[PDB]
Amino acid sequence: MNDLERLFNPSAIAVVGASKDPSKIGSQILRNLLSYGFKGKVYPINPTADELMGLKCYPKVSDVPDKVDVAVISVPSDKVLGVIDDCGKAGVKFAVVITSGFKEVGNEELEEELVRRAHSYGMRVLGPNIFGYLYAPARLNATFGPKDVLSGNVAFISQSGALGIALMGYTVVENIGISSIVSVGNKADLDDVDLLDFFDKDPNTGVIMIYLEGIAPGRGRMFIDVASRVSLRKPIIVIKAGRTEVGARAAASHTGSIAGSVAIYESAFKQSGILMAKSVEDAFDWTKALSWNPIPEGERLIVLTNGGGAGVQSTDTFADNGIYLSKPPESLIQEIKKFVPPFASFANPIDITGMAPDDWYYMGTLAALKNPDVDALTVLYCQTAVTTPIGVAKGIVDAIKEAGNSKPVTVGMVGGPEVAEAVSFLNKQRIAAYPTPERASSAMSALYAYARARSYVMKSLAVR
Amino acid sequence: MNDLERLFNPSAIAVVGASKDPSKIGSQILRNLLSYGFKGKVYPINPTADELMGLKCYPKVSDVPDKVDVAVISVPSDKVLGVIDDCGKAGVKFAVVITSGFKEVGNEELEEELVRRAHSYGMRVLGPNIFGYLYAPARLNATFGPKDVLSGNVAFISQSGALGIALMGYTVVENIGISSIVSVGNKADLDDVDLLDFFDKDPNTGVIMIYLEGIAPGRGRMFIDVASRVSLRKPIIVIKAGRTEVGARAAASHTGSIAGSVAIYESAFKQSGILMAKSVEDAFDWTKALSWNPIPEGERLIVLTNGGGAGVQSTDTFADNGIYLSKPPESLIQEIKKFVPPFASFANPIDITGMAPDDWYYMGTLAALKNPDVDALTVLYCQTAVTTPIGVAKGIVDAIKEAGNSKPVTVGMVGGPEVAEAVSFLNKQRIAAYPTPERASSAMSALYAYARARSYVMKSLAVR
Amino acid sequence: SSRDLLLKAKENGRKSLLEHEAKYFISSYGIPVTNIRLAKSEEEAVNFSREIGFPVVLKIVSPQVVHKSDVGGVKVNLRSEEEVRKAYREIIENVKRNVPNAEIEGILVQEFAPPGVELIIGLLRDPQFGPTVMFGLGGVFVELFRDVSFRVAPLSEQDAESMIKEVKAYKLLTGFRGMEPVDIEAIKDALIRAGRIGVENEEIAEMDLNPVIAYPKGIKVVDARIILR
Amino acid sequence: SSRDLLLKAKENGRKSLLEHEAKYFISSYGIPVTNIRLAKSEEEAVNFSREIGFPVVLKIVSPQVVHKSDVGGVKVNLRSEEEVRKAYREIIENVKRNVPNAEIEGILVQEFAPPGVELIIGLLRDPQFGPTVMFGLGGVFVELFRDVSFRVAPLSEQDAESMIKEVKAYKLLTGFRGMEPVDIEAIKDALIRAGRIGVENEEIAEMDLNPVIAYPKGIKVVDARIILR
Ligand SMILES: Nc1ncnc2c1ncn2[C@@H]1O[C@H](COP(=O)(O)OP(=O)(O)O)[C@@H](O)[C@H]1O
Ligand SMILES: Nc1ncnc2c1ncn2[C@@H]1O[C@H](COP(=O)(O)OP(=O)(O)O)[C@@H](O)[C@H]1O
Ligand SMILES: [Mg+2]
Ligand SMILES: [Mg+2]
Ligand code: NA
Ligand code: NA
Ligand code: NA
Numbered sequence A, B: 001m002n003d004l005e006r007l008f009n010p011s012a013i014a015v016v017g018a019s020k021d022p023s024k025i026g027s028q029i030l031r032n033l034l035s036y037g038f039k040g041k042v043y044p045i046n047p048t049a050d051e052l053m054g055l056k057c058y059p060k061v062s063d064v065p066d067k068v069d070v071a072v073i074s075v076p077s078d079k080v081l082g083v084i085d086d087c088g089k090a091g092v093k094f095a096v097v098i099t100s101g102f103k104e105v106g107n108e109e110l111e112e113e114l115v116r117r118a119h120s121y122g123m124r125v126l127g128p129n130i131f132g133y134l135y136a137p138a139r140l141n142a143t144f145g146p147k148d149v150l151s152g153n154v155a156f157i158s159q160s161g162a163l164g165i166a167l168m169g170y171t172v173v174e175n176i177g178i179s180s181i182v183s184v185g186n187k188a189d190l191d192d193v194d195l196l197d198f199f200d201k202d203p204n205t206g207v208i209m210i211y212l213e214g215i216a217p218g219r220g221r222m223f224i225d226v227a228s229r230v231s232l233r234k235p236i237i238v239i240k241a242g243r244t245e246v247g248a249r250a251a252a253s254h255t256g257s258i259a260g261s262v263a264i265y266e267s268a269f270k271q272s273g274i275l276m277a278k279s280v281e282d283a284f285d286w287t288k289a290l291s292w293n294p295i296p297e298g299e300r301l302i303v304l305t306n307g308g309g310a311g312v313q314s315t316d317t318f319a320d321n322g323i324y325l326s327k328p329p330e331s332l333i334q335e336i337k338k339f340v341p342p343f344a345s346f347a348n349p350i351d352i353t354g355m356a357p358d359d360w361y362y363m364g365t366l367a368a369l370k371n372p373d374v375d376a377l378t379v380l381y382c383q384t385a386v387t388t389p390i391g392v393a394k395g396i397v398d399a400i401k402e403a404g405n406s407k408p409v410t411v412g413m414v415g416g417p418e419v420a421e422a423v424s425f426l427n428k429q430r431i432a433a434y435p436t437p438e439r440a441s442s443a444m445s446a447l448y449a450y451a452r453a454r455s456y457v458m459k460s461l462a463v464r
Numbered sequence C, D: 001s002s003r004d005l006l007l008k009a010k011e012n013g014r015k016s017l018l019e020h021e022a023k024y025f026i027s028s029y030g031i032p033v034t035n036i037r038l039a040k041s042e043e044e045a046v047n048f049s050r051e052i053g054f055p056v057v058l059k060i061v062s063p064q065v066v067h068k069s070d071v072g073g074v075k076v077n078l079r080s081e082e083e084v085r086k087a088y089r090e091i092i093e094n095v096k097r098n099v100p101n102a103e104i105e106g107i108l109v110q111e112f113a114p115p116g117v118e119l120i121i122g123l124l125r126d127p128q129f130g131p132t133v134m135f136g137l138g139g140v141f142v143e144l145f146r147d148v149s150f151r152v153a154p155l156s157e158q159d160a161e162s163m164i165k166e167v168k169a170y171k172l173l174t175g176f177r178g179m180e181p182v183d184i185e186a187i188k189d190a191l192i193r194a195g196r197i198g199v200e201n202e203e204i205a206e207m208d209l210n211p212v213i214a215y216p217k218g219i220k221v222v223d224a225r226i227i228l229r
Helices: A025-036 A077-089 A108-120 A161-173 A192-201 A220-231 A245-255 A262-272 A280-292 A308-320 A330-337 A358-370 A389-403 A417-428 A437-460 B025-036 B077-089 B108-120 B161-173 B192-201 B220-231 B245-255 B262-272 B280-292 B308-320 B330-337 B358-370 B389-403 B417-428 B437-460 C003-011 C019-027 C042-052 C081-098 C157-166 C184-200 D003-011 D019-027 D042-052 D081-098 D157-166 D184-200
Strands: A012-016 A041-045 A070-073 A094-097 A124-126 A132-135 A140-143 A151-158 A178-183 A207-212 A236-240 A275-277 A301-305 A376-382 A409-414 B012-016 B041-045 B070-073 B094-097 B124-126 B132-135 B140-143 B151-158 B178-183 B207-212 B236-240 B275-277 B301-305 B376-382 B409-414 B432-434 C036-039 C056-061 C074-078 C106-111 C117-126 C130-137 C148-152 C204-214 C219-221 C224-228 D036-039 D056-061 D074-078 D106-111 D117-126 D130-137 D148-152 D204-214 D219-221 D224-228
Touching: A012 A025, A012 A140, A025 A041, A025 A140, A070 A077, A077 A094, A077 A108, A108 A124, A151 A161, A151 A192, A151 A280, A161 A178, A161 A207, A161 A280, A161 B308, A161 B376, A161 B409, A161 B417, A192 A207, A192 A220, A207 A280, A220 A236, A220 A262, A220 A437, A220 C148, A236 A262, A236 A280, A245 B308, A262 A275, A262 A437, A262 C148, A262 C157, A275 A280, A275 A437, A280 A437, A280 B437, A301 A308, A301 A358, A301 A437, A308 A376, A308 A409, A308 A437, A308 B161, A308 B245, A330 A358, A358 A376, A358 A389, A376 A389, A376 A437, A376 B161, A389 A409, A389 A417, A409 A417, A409 A437, A409 B161, A417 B161, A437 B280, A437 C157, B012 B025, B012 B140, B025 B041, B025 B140, B070 B077, B077 B094, B077 B108, B108 B124, B151 B161, B151 B192, B151 B280, B161 B178, B161 B207, B161 B280, B192 B207, B192 B220, B207 B280, B220 B236, B220 B262, B220 B437, B220 D148, B236 B262, B236 B280, B262 B275, B262 B437, B262 D148, B262 D157, B275 B280, B275 B437, B280 B432, B280 B437, B301 B308, B301 B358, B301 B437, B308 B376, B308 B409, B308 B437, B330 B358, B358 B376, B358 B389, B376 B389, B376 B437, B389 B409, B389 B417, B409 B417, B409 B437, B417 B432, B432 B437, B437 D157, C003 C019, C003 C224, C019 C036, C019 C056, C019 C184, C019 C204, C019 C224, C036 C042, C042 C056, C042 C081, C042 C106, C056 C081, C074 C081, C081 C106, C117 C148, C117 C184, C130 C157, C130 C184, C148 C157, C157 C184, C184 C204, C184 C219, D003 D019, D003 D224, D019 D036, D019 D056, D019 D184, D019 D204, D019 D224, D036 D042, D042 D056, D042 D081, D042 D106, D056 D081, D074 D081, D081 D106, D117 D148, D117 D184, D130 D157, D130 D184, D148 D157, D157 D184, D184 D204, D184 D219
Parallel strands: A012 A041, A012 A070, A070 A094, A094 A124, A151 A178, A151 A207, A207 A236, A236 A275, A301 A376, A376 A409, B012 B041, B012 B070, B070 B094, B094 B124, B151 B178, B151 B207, B207 B236, B236 B275, B301 B376, B376 B409, B409 B432
Antiparallel strands: A132 A140, A132 A178, B132 B140, B132 B178, C036 C106, C056 C074, C056 C106, C117 C130, C117 C204, C130 C148, C204 C219, C204 C224, D036 D106, D056 D074, D056 D106, D117 D130, D117 D204, D130 D148, D204 D219, D204 D224
């Protein structure tokens, strides 16, 4: 009932609602399951079809000559209960109820009934009203969203359907590698706590991002207990929907609920070690940095820039996040004075001046990263005719390799189309790069915010 | 002395420091002047060259048989005073001193002497320590930055050289149409106040964006008087460097000065009707919206969305900017109920649900914009397989055309690479589009912020 | 057991504890309260006042009177027998006028707490997160500015310390013009204990320690309300 | 002209105005001040005290004593002729002992301001923006929390009104427990005048109206400091 191993790694999946019509939801899901490359058995379920997409079809899950782990259900809402009973008889462990038309439209009784019946068979429910789920390590795409994601270590959980399925697509554009996408929708049964327990134990998942509108009554304490322990090893980013009083009342009506307290949700996230993102862009920017970098081991952050202006944008942005730069170590200053002009600034940011050619980025970045008194590095670049963006980017890459260590690095590059390409090159190398200095600084800030959140939790778990 | 008409629209420009060596700054400037298409006379100035890039060259500006309006001076700092004397002898009105090595490196005496000498000839100085300037209506690119910008109505003034020249390139990537780029650098003579006076009167300029580190002692009152008056007709966005206590001390040392008061600068920008941006991204996002839209005539802002989640993100972001949505007009609701399913939400945001096809975006957008009780529209789109991003975008374009009016519109689209193209398509049509719902809402919020800032100024100028 | 107070109130159909019952209850959890005595006669009131020592405070004790100040039921800083007897009858009548037939349990005699920095410690039940502790500075800082912090119970020392530092009026605790720093450890301790009260006692819907007066050494709960469910 | 007060101070090499001179100066700009009289004898003091009305306040006036409280030079809430004569001689000695090398201009007789909501109105000169008006709530709100708003002078009504609404303690002006709303129009009016003082008088480096007491009708400046340059 509480172990989700067979949901994410099933041997057999039935798709209920697939048909000869390719426009049907069930049909789209079936298509994604096959194109993404699921290696287990897939059983299309359809009253009349003999075969769908080259697969033997059955009229009911109970007719399948096999143990079905998961049934993906997309039939009309007034047919769902029947399908649930059949799945129950057939011994199905997980009912992934795609179908909408439940509590979110006022039919609360139907939803409660759905869960009751599923539970009487020892079966758990995901949804209803969801777009499905994806698990990259099982080459399992049981959604009607995009057919593919970049492979990686980020798990994304979404209470929102349309925004969830769109963000599944946006991860590709933002170069975020995904281990899983889970649509939880109405959260009538399986919820965030259940999922965090699975992702805690999943070695494929290193970062968890959640779009969260609300938590069920009586579930919050357990949410804090689980999330806080997960946070000790894996960062959790929450995009809280309804994070203002106004928005909280708005989202209250969208799901048909009583409005949760903004202030208390915020304290719960603090006690859980969770980073709360106010926007998609912040959430994704932070998820990138957290996914591709270890947390800094101390507060010795260096900013390297070929322009004072970008450096001050960075300093102001770090400051907004409670991050204050201190004088670089003297050894680093000396190492850099070997090539830098007399009127470079070494206050931190280290300003290597606008005259800096590509190779100074290689040398500065390398010196910073090898220095034993440097914990983290943000590299800022402003495009000038003296440099090439791709050359600066390759210098940073080479430096990171030759330094050998893993210290957190973020990169901000400002300029034209050549910068856009250099930034894309870096992100495709899993070096967190952004097109403005403030975003690169906000991303680095997320690494420190997570280090501080983890410390909050460790302190709160101390034995007396 | 105070009229900049001949700086931006000169009949004759001399470039001092150009040579057969293409890597010299002067040569880069000369190359840009020719490629961007300046139609007046260009006079390369060089001691020995008989010709540069097909143009008769002279050893001194005073040898040019013409009235030179502007001399772009790129020679070593210890030669600048001499070139200034010669420009003075020749009756030159503006000295654009590219050359660095003045107050920014401690040579305050040289900088003050520069200005003193220029003033003794009735000449003004831009800079020193700048990358030049561009004025699109005069096809004048007197910078060593990118060779081209998109034409439009945005004037960009930058006190930072590296960030300024980088942002000059970034305007292309962000589809921002430019009327002018002015590098002001050390601001020894001509400053933001002088420039604001010119852009106030320029019919080609509709929006002014300023990267500002600081204003000179005794210059702030005049800055408010001028800016407040410009703000009545043209929005001014300032990216303030040193907007935190920490950053203010930092930038104090970067320019070699005492730290300006953060709080008092904020009050001065409020009294000026200025929008202060905390980041490059915000500044550019707002600039786009302000450049391509009139200000809303009232508070009847409609958010149209195919998903509750994007809508809630939007509601929260508007709420953070003090913008609260109210019920749509009944007429608009009835118009939309003609095609929308029964469980669509009309609270504002208007949720036309995730199953909405491309055409509902055309119909909804058209209905909203044509409604006499709607003042502004933010359209949100989450990519689903039911739609195409480009079809939604073309629907939005068509609705805007057919509505005929100009009500402010911003668009937020979330999804994969096809959304990235559709967003790009919209911005190339000068429809302010963004890849997240919060950025589209923050952009719309800037239109309202400007309306309120202008109202602050109007109220503060009220007659007793 | 102090739970007998809760059971007793539930048995009598009351939905809140009287002030003396509430203070006794939180005291048993180790939260410092005013020394108190329930007087049933004017003679009891004078006699207890001597025992406790001057100055004292007299408060009406009635299931009916939830807001005692706003009905003339609170007499503060009484330094003599005459001031006490005046207060006794005065409250009897101030309350007889605004609250007739009220079942008076009696009049509470308690020491007049010297001036300090006033605090509020609250306990509520959030539908999601259950028992939640609330902290803020007293007076206008909570009442008017809503400057409050929350932690979901049970509280660790880290939770209590950080929620104190979080409120915008925090510097009122670390010394300002005419006021020494107060005992932060004592505040932390009371916050953790308030959390424990909420976790352990299901029948307690809500608790409000207001004012709680903080001193350079120790704190004292001057008024306490406990609502039952 | 009130400028004679500034010119006199500069002529005698002084870099600030005495309390009575500062109140005269701002009063001439239409900013309400505590009614005052400069007494040169214990006898002048009783007569002025009756004119002004009881209760009164007596303060030592000397170029040397900048902090009158910190030398026993301030006597508040004097309600009788005798209390006045008592405060008079007592101040003469409180200061004669702690500062024997001190020039007395006299003793200021002053109206005792009843309690209200305290404010601060400041004027400073910013290097960029010149004369700038500062507003905040009195007491800990400016001193400890730094809750202040600024507007560059001259101030429009719009500037004055918005800068008042901007401060975090704004609600202390619109009515709270035990306090009626105060005269916002009078505050706006004083802020505007304060700005005018700064724009017009180049020799004034800094001005601090603190405390300023706001009432349901009108305000009163109780202490005023003006620094010269
Ligand atoms: N024992 C006490 N020591 C000091 N002050 C007290 C004491 N009891 C009450 N007060 C003061 O009197 C106020 C009113 O009393 P309180 O117990 O709060 O009754 P209520 O809130 O029902 O009117 C308190 O807020 C506090 O300022
Ligand atoms: N006329 C007055 N009416 C009411 N309170 C007064 C009066 N004069 C002084 N006070 C109070 O006494 C305090 C001390 O006097 P003040 O003028 O500030 O002198 P100083 O700061 O040099 O000691 C003031 O801050 C104010 O709170
Ligand atoms: Mg009370
Ligand atoms: Mg004082
Ligand atoms: Na520089
Ligand atoms: Na600079
Ligand atoms: Na409305």
